[PDB]
UniProtKB/Swiss-Prot annotation:
Belongs to the OspA lipoprotein family. Its main location: membrane. It comes from Borreliella burgdorferi (strain ATCC 35210 / DSM 4680 / CIP 102532 / B31) (Borrelia burgdorferi). It is found in: Cell outer membrane; Cell surface. This is Outer surface protein A.
Amino acid sequence: NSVSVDLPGSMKVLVSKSSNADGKYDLIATVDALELSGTSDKNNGSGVLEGVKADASKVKLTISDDLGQTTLEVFKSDGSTLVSKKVTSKDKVLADVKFNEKGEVSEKIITRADGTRLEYTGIKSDGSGKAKEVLKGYVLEGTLTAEKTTLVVKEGTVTLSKNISKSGAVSVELNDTDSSAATKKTAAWNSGTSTLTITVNSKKTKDLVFTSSNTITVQQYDSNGTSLEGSAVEITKLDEIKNALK
């Protein structure tokens, strides 16, 4: 009878082939080992299913009308306070959220469609916390405030800071405490190309590109300090970022 429907978040739902006397459709799903069930106004697998864990926590699976988004929620046993919320949106991005005993967000892990992650932990009531960005081959560590995420790499007297605004905008800055004008690094950020250009002793040395694919590339300038040379090389480990800051 029933029809299997594929869902975001690596889940499936079975929907009845025909409606009941109220015109409603039956929904069944199994998530891990838990049986969920519900009824829906629609015939395509969308709607709400509910179940209860062995420890009496309430579970709810909400499937959006167009099947683009799924939300999997766990509540305390009276159903009033959230414990966890997993949302897969239609771009296949995953937001994995944990809550404290008061239902306030305490941890949020975002997995981008390409597998890279933003990990926010120890989140406090002012929206501050610890931050990590998990990239292909390396991780960046730092902090979260309500204004921005700041991830830091240090090499010698140079500190590289990657900022992700609350609006999602990336900006990068470099600060060097070297007092010698011969070796001190400075840098300019080009928001139009997401590129940090490093200068030493009044000549450009390197472009660091922070790409839309969540990678970093480095390309050197010629000794003339005005033309790029060669071709950009993709960073594959944290040691290679540090090398670019030497």
